[PDB]
RNA sequence: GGAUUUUUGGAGCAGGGAGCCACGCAUCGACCUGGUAUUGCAGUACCUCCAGGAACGGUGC
């Protein structure tokens, strides 16, 4: 696309199912409620996938920005 | 700024302080702190009440801490739930 | 709001602090500054996997703190007022 | 022209061609090796070529010294406690000196890391069995006089002198 | 002189497929086509992949935003 | 910072530097920046295994320095 | 002729490199520092300089009424440092006495006095052990058969240096009783001073310390004047001039007239305004 | 917002020690105030990777393979 | 080929590892004067060869005459004055 | 308020603990915003090593206690 | 005054077993024996090839 930046991409993905990988290898799937300037992230109906396998169903979750490796829409 | 605390991802903390509800904090130390948020800030420093700290050593362990201050860098994840209920 | 301000009020309290490197510190706060650099007296400090050592004074770089365990008595609602 | 602290302090200091820190003590007409304390153990190599030293002795404890170039001096004897002051001595170049008897080379057996040894242009060189004698008495040497110590020579030196 | 940010701007324009070296993790690297990026070197990658150097295995990701925290190094790949 | 001024004072002197990874670099400090970025020359490096090497020219980022040893020639900023 | 009492033999001998200012060449011994370290040792502040000196006075008391438990680490370390200080101070303040003689005397007293009965004997509790065990003993018999036991072997093998250092602190402090008293006095005095008093006293100690041992342009002006401003003369070597007054002086010069006259343009005052 | 003093090293061949025990070699083509680098003809220590960006964050040490 | 600060050596046993070759070369040639630097590569083109650079020119000439055909690691070395001036010499001169 | 908490210990001998767990003991002569420290006559314990005049970066500092009083010199 | 050089963290976690001695997996590197090619004037990740040897070294789990 004509330049698609970090910020708009993430904003487009609000209201959507996402999965976030953390640096530590945990993964969290849920609906992205919001993100902020520092790229802290809020998920609803979160699920946890560790070793790529469903571990725990967690609900509403804040992820501190420094933990994030990458975010994927899914 | 208050708006960003109110509606942004930190609203999780803002909501927990207002409703005096419990939250589980997954923590860098591989420990989890389960309790109520008395105060919080940008960095996710917190003043916590009725904290149940849980961890593992395999053997699970826990311990009660009535009053404590958490430096926010140690935060991995903060969870709000039907936990308080 | 700025919670370091709250910690700066805790001079002359005795606390237990857990460090990022696992070390445990019990002593009486002489001063917390804006960087959360914390200074104590009458300190019993137990590095992970040692028996305690006692120090008359100890000064901690703020960033190395994991968390403070506060006195049960502490009147938080007072201290949270500005 | 005594080898003095003052002498060492004004001496050319540089990184040599084989990437080691070397101190230049060439052509000063030094007669006796002394006062090395002042180098502060900061050199990998020390060049003592073209001087008048008689005995390879007098060194302080120098843990970093790995190369000693001692060309064109008058070395006729080697000190006995060399490994105690130079534990990692790996290369010793003694070309064109005065070692005359095979037995005078005996003190080099105590230098455990000594791997490169050069004794060319010394009278001792023409003594019968000079090469085999060095190989058996200083087995830690891998290259002697710029020639590889080979297995066959080791065995041959094991027969003679066994 | 070429400035590093500009190189990226070039990668962006070219739609060259990019391989990223991550911080303190050698066994995995990330790949994708830079669509956009920001002042923090946070990248939006398209049709992205996790590359396991040990397992010779690839994990398919699609639309990725990688935080710049992890960036050690940026290289281009012909594929 | 006061330590920074004292570092700049050591420019032109032989100094020792340990990195965050414990490699030890000794040689002449050519330039020291405000952020502790260090240009040096005619280095001896001593790795974590103990082995040494020799380098002509190096530059180390300030953040990735654990510490520096400076001459004692400087010790004699006593005001502070 | 007559300025320095020191002989050529010891011309670079300086006492100030041996004595600090607070010691006044043996008049006092500076124990404030050790009061600091001590505060660090007791992990509190209930202890004043004077109460600390009161503690030092202990040095049977230092053995049976110890400030801290004699098996405490911080304490034993402190005691070591302090002991060392007192000893060096002692020999420092009395150069003329044979140091080795004194050392050996003390060492022999240490070895010989202890062995039979701990040198410390009580009509009630019997014989005390110095440093290593810290226990009494009914009779000399059980005392002797205790000096071979695994316990005493362990202790005498671990706490030897400390015990010996303690002992030295003891005997050296005894030999310096006059200096100890002198200093304690000083402390009380300075303490009872005012501000001005304490200041003047310090002045005195200082003077005693550092006294001979034997008495007998601008830009705002060059811009105003018009100089250091870039300018060039073309006829002279495309030369540069830094001021307009100076270039106006170039018009009458040797080389400028040489360029004119040798150029074929004759000298003096018609050509003054020349550039190219 | 200072620059790193690297003009001296411009267009020279260099040896780069990176975190993770990683080492690469190449020619300095440019830099910014964060010490992010552009390195040309880069080689992973050996396989040729071409012109690359190294984030200054992960730069431990550099060594010139030339004389400056 | 006029006398030169740098000597070109060929006919060297190419089985010696590069760093060992250079260190023995340095050792051997130190007897005639300070060796400023040694250039030796193992490429197909350059294998079995080395350029030895000396501070003094008299040192280079002495080395050339005295070590012509010296057995080094088994082979007789062939020495000659280099065709061109060494980069290091040119920089040290101007 | 006072800023003294560091300035008090200045000139004193100080025991400093590093992030890897080393012990640096030297004379505390200067500090700054980052807690970069200047340590005179400094030794390292883990194995005692004499270092001398040391500048330590604050990033890698954990903590400090008073080890002994100032040397008079 | 939490976004690369310091203070809001890339950290976290994993070693005993067998009879003083010895050790799983993956990647890279010289490296050591034989034999074999190459005779070439340069500024260097590294450097012939063929067969055999590794009770070699470094990093990660």
From Swiss-Prot, chain C:
- UniProt protein name: Small nuclear ribonucleoprotein Sm D1
One biological process term in Gene Ontology: 7-methylguanosine cap hypermethylation
Residues included from the entire protein: 1 to 82 of 119
- Say yes or no: keyword Ubl conjugation present: yes
Q: Which UniProt keywords apply?
A: Cytoplasm, Isopeptide bond, Methylation, mRNA processing, mRNA splicing, Nucleus, Repeat, Ribonucleoprotein, Spliceosome, Ubl conjugation
Q: Which organism is it from?
A: Homo sapiens (Human)
Q: Identify the stretch(es) annotated as Sufficient for interaction with CLNS1A.
A: 1-80
Changing residue 60 to R has the effect of: Loss of interaction with CLNS1A
This protein's record includes keyword Cell wall biogenesis/degradation: no
Domain Sm: residue ranges = 2-74
Record GO terms (molecular function): RNA binding; U1 snRNP binding
Record PTM = Methylated on arginine residues by PRMT5 and PRMT7; probable asymmetric dimethylation which is required for assembly and biogenesis of snRNPs.
Describe the protein's quaternary organization and the partners it interacts with. Core component of the spliceosomal U1, U2, U4 and U5 small nuclear ribonucleoproteins (snRNPs), the building blocks of the spliceosome. Most spliceosomal snRNPs contain a common set of Sm proteins, SNRPB, SNRPD1, SNRPD2, SNRPD3, SNRPE, SNRPF and SNRPG that assemble in a heptameric protein ring on the Sm site of the small nuclear RNA to form the core snRNP. Component of the U1 snRNP. The U1 snRNP is composed of the U1 snRNA and the 7 core Sm proteins SNRPB, SNRPD1, SNRPD2, SNRPD3, SNRPE, SNRPF and SNRPG, and at least three U1 snRNP-specific proteins SNRNP70/U1-70K, SNRPA/U1-A and SNRPC/U1-C.
- According to its record, what are the GO cellular component terms? catalytic step 2 spliceosome; commitment complex; cytosol; methylosome; nucleoplasm; nucleus; pICln-Sm protein complex; precatalytic spliceosome
Q: Where in the cell is it found?
A: Cytoplasm, Cytosol; Nucleus
Specify the superkingdom.
Eukaryota
UniProtKB/Swiss-Prot annotation, chain D:
Residue ranges annotated for the LRRCT domain, each copy included: 122-160
Query: Which effect does the record note for changing residue 71 to K?
Result: No change in spliceosome assembly
Keyword annotations for this protein, in alphabetical order, are: Acetylation, Isopeptide bond, Leucine-rich repeat, mRNA processing, mRNA splicing, Nucleus, Phosphoprotein, Repeat, Ribonucleoprotein, RNA-binding, Spliceosome, Ubl conjugation
Q: Where in the cell is it found?
A: Nucleus
Gene Ontology CC entries for this record: catalytic step 2 spliceosome; nuclear body; nuclear speck; nucleoplasm; nucleus; small nuclear ribonucleoprotein complex; spliceosomal complex; U2 snRNP
Q: Which domain of life is it from?
A: Eukaryota
Provide the primary localization.
nucleus
| Single biological process term from Gene Ontology | mRNA splicing, via spliceosome
State how changing residue 147 to R affects the protein, per the record: Results in defective spliceosome assembly
Gene Ontology MF terms: RNA binding; U2 snRNA binding
Question: Where do the LRR repeats start and stop?
Answer: 19-40, 42-63, 64-85, 88-109
- State the family it belongs to: Belongs to the U2 small nuclear ribonucleoprotein A family.
The record's function comment reads: Involved in pre-mRNA splicing as component of the spliceosome. Associated with sn-RNP U2, where it contributes to the binding of stem loop IV of U2 snRNA.
Subunit structure of this chain's protein: Identified in the spliceosome B complex. Identified in the spliceosome C complex. Found in a pre-mRNA splicing complex with SFRS4, SFRS5, SNRNP70, SNRPA1, SRRM1 and SRRM2. Found in a pre-mRNA exonic splicing enhancer (ESE) complex with SNRNP70, SNRPA1, SRRM1 and TRA2B. Contributes to the binding of stem loop IV of U2 snRNA with SNRPB2.
Q: What is this protein called?
A: U2 small nuclear ribonucleoprotein A'
From Swiss-Prot, chain F:
Q: Which positions fall inside the Sm domain?
A: 2-74
User: Complete protein: which residues are present?
Assistant: 4 to 85 of 126
**Does this entry carry the keyword Lyase?**
no
Give the source species: Homo sapiens (Human)
Q: Posttranslational modification, per the record?
A: Methylated on arginine residues by PRMT5 and PRMT7; probable asymmetric dimethylation which is required for assembly and biogenesis of snRNPs.
Q: Spell out the subcellular localization from the entry.
A: Cytoplasm, Cytosol; Nucleus
Gene Ontology molecular function: any one: enzyme binding
Q: Which GO terms describe its biological process?
A: 7-methylguanosine cap hypermethylation; mRNA splicing, via spliceosome; protein methylation; RNA splicing; spliceosomal snRNP assembly; U2-type prespliceosome assembly
Query: Per its record, how is this protein called by name?
Result: Small nuclear ribonucleoprotein Sm D3
> Anything else of interest in the record?
In the autoimmune disease systemic lupus erythematosus, antinuclear antibodies are developed with Sm specificity.
Single GO cellular component term? commitment complex
**Assembly information from the UniProt record:** Core component of the spliceosomal U1, U2, U4 and U5 small nuclear ribonucleoproteins (snRNPs), the building blocks of the spliceosome. Most spliceosomal snRNPs contain a common set of Sm proteins, SNRPB, SNRPD1, SNRPD2, SNRPD3, SNRPE, SNRPF and SNRPG that assemble in a heptameric protein ring on the Sm site of the small nuclear RNA to form the core snRNP. Component of the U1 snRNP. The U1 snRNP is composed of the U1 snRNA and the 7 core Sm proteins SNRPB, SNRPD1, SNRPD2, SNRPD3, SNRPE, SNRPF and SNRPG, and at least three U1 snRNP-specific proteins SNRNP70/U1-70K, SNRPA/U1-A and SNRPC/U1-C.
Q: Is the keyword Lipid metabolism assigned to this protein?
A: no
Instruction: Please tell me where this protein is predominantly located.
Output: cytoplasm
Curated annotation (Swiss-Prot), chain I:
| More info | Patients with systemic lupus erythematosus produce antibodies which interact with snRNP proteins.
SUBUNIT field = Identified in the spliceosome B complex. Identified in the spliceosome C complex. Present in a spliceosome complex assembled in vitro, and composed of SNRPB2, HPRP8BP and CRNKL1. Contributes to the binding of stem loop IV of U2 snRNA with SNRPP1.
Q: What is the lineage of its organism?
A: Eukaryota, Metazoa, Chordata, Craniata, Vertebrata
Q: Where in the cell is it found?
A: Nucleus
What are the residue boundaries of the RRM domain, all occurrences included? 5-84
Is Calcium set as a keyword in this record? no
Q: Which GO terms describe its biological process?
A: mRNA splicing, via spliceosome; U2-type prespliceosome assembly
Origin superkingdom: Eukaryota
Specify the protein name: U2 small nuclear ribonucleoprotein B''
Q: What does this protein do?
A: Involved in pre-mRNA splicing as component of the spliceosome. Associated with sn-RNP U2, where it contributes to the binding of stem loop IV of U2 snRNA.
Q: Which GO terms describe its molecular function?
A: U1 snRNA binding
Its GO CC terms are: catalytic step 2 spliceosome; cytoplasmic ribonucleoprotein granule; fibrillar center; nuclear speck; nucleoplasm; nucleus; spliceosomal complex; U1 snRNP
Annotated organism of origin: Homo sapiens
């Amino acid at each position: 696309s004509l330049p698609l930046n970090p910020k708009p991409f993430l904003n487009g993905l609000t209201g959507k199912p996402v999965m976030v990988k953390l640096k530590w290898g945990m993964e969290y799937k849920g609906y992205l409620v919001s993100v902020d300037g520092y790229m802290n992230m809020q998920l609803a109906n979160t699920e946890e996938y560790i070793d790529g396998a469903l571990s725990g169903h967690l609900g509403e979750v804040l992820i501190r920005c420094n933990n994030v490796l990458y975010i994927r829409g899914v | 700024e208050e708006e960003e605390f109110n509606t942004g991802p930190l609203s999780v903390l803002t909501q927990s302080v207002k409703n005096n509800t419990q939250v589980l904090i997954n923590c860098r130390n591989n420990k989890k702190l389960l309790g109520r948020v008395k105060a919080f800030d940008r960095h996710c420093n917190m003043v916590l009440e009725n904290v149940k700290e849980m961890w593992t050593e395999p053997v699970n362990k826990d311990r009660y801490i009535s009053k404590m201050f958490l430096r926010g860098d140690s935060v991995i994840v903060v969870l709000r739930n039907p936990l308080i209920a | 709001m700025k919670l370091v301000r709250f910690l700066m009020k805790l001079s002359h309290e005795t606390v237990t602090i857990e460090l990022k490197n696992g070390t445990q510190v019990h002593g009486t706060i002489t001063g917390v500054d804006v960087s959360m650099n914390t200074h104590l007296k009458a300190v019993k400090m137990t590095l992970k996997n040692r028996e305690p050592v006692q120090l008359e004074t100890l000064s901690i770089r703020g960033n190395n703190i994991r968390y403070f365990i506060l006195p049960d008595s502490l009147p938080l609602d007072t201290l949270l007022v500005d | 022209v005594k080898l003095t602290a003052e002498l060492i302090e004004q001496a050319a200091q540089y990184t040599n061609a084989v990437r080691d820190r070397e101190l230049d003590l060439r052509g000063y007409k030094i007669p006796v090796i002394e006062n090395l304390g002042a180098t502060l153990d900061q050199f990998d190599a020390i060049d003592f070529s073209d001087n008048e030293i008689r005995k390879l002795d007098g060194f302080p404890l120098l843990r970093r010294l790995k190369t000693l170039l001692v060309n064109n001096n008058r070395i006729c004897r080697i000190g006995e406690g060399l490994d105690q002051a130079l534990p990692c001595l790996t290369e010793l170049i003694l070309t064109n000196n005065s070692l005359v008897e095979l037995g005078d080379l005996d003190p080099l057996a105590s230098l455990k890391s000594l791997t490169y040894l050069s004794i060319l242009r010394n009278p001792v060189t023409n003594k019968k069995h000079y090469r085999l004698y060095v190989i058996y008495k200083v087995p830690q040497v891998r290259v002697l006089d710029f020639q590889k110590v080979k297995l066959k020579e080791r065995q041959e030196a094991e027969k003679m002198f066994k | 002189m070429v400035q590093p940010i500009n190189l990226i701007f070039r990668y962006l324009q070219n739609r060259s497929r990019i391989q990223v070296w991550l911080y303190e993790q050698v066994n995995m690297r990330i790949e994708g086509c830079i669509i956009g990026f920001d002042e923090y070197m946070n990248l939006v990658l398209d049709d992205a992949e996790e590359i396991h150097s040990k397992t010779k295995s690839r994990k398919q990701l699609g639309r990725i935003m990688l935080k710049g925290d992890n960036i050690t190094l940026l290289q281009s790949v012909s594929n | 910072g006061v330590p920074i001024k004292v570092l700049h004072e050591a420019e032109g002197h032989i100094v020792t530097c340990e990195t965050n990874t414990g490699e030890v670099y000794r040689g002449k400090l050519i330039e020291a920046e405000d952020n502790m970025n260090c240009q040096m020359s005619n280095i001896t490096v001593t790795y974590r295994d103990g082995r040494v090497a020799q380098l002509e020219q190096v530059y180390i980022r300030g953040s990735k320095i654990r510490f520096l040893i400076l001459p004692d020639m400087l010790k004699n900023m006593l005001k502070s | 002729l007559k300025a320095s009492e020191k002989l050529d033999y010891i011309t670079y001998l300086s006492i100030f490199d041996q004595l600090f200012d607070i010691p006044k060449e043996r008049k006092n011994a500076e124990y404030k520092r050790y009061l600091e370290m001590l505060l660090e040792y007791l992990q509190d502040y209930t202890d004043r300089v004077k109460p600390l000196q009161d503690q030092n006075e202990l040095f049977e008391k230092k053995w049976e009424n110890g400030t801290f438990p004699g098996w405490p680490k911080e304490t034993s370390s402190a005691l070591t440092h302090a002991g060392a200080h007192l000893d060096l101070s002692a020999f420092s303040s009395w150069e003329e006495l044979a140091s080795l003689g004194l050392d050996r005397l003390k060492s022999a007293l240490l070895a010989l006095g202890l062995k039979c009965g701990g040198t410390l004997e009580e009509r009630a509790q019997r014989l005390f052990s110095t440093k290593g065990k810290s226990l009494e003993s009914l009779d000399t018999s059980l005392f002797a058969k205790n000096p071979k036991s695994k316990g005493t072997k362990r202790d005498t093998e671990r706490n030897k240096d400390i015990a010996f250092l303690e002992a030295q602190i003891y005997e050296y402090v005894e030999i310096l009783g006059e200096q100890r008293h002198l200093t304690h006095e000083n402390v009380q005095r300075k303490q009872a001073r005012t501000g001005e008093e304490r200041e003047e006293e310090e002045e005195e100690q200082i003077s005693e310390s550092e006294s001979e041992d034997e008495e007998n342009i601008p830009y705002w002006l060059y811009k105003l004047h018009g100089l250091n401003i870039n300018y060039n003369c073309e006829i002279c070597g495309n030369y540069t001039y830094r001021g307009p007054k100076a270039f106006q002086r170039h018009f009458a010069e040797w080389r400028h007239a040489h360029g004119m006259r040798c150029l074929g343009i004759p000298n003096t005052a018609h050509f003054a305004n020349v550039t190219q | 917002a200072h620059p790193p003093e690297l003009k001296k090293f411009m267009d020279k061949k260099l040896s780069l020690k990176l975190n993770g025990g990683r080492h690469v070699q190449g020619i300095l083509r440019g830099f910014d105030p964060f010490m992010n680098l552009v390195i040309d003809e880069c080689v992973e220590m050996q396989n040729n990777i071409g012109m690359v960006v190294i984030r200054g964050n992960s730069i431990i040490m550099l060594e010139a393979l030339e004389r400056v | 080929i006029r006398p030169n600060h740098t000597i070109y050596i060929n006919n060297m046993n190419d089985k010696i590892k590069k760093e060992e070759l250079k260190r023995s070369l340095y050792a051997l040639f130190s007897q005639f004067g300070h060796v400023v630097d040694i250039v030796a590569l193992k490429t197909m083109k350059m294998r079995g060869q080395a350029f030895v650079i000396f501070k003094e020119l008299g040192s280079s000439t002495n080395a050339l005459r005295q070590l012509q055909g010296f057995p080094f690691y088994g082979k007789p070395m062939r020495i000659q004055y280099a065709k061109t001036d060494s980069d290091i010499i040119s920089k040290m001169r101007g | 308020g006072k800023s003294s908490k560091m300035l008090q210990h200045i000139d004193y001998r100080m025991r400093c603990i590093l992030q890897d767990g080393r012990i640096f003991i030297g004379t505390f002569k200067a500090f700054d915003k980052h807690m970069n420290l200047i340590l005179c006559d400094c030794d390292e314990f883990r194995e005692k090593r004499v270092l001398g005049l040391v500048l330590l970066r604050g990033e890698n500092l954990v903590s400090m206690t008073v080890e002994g009083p100032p040397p008079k010199d």
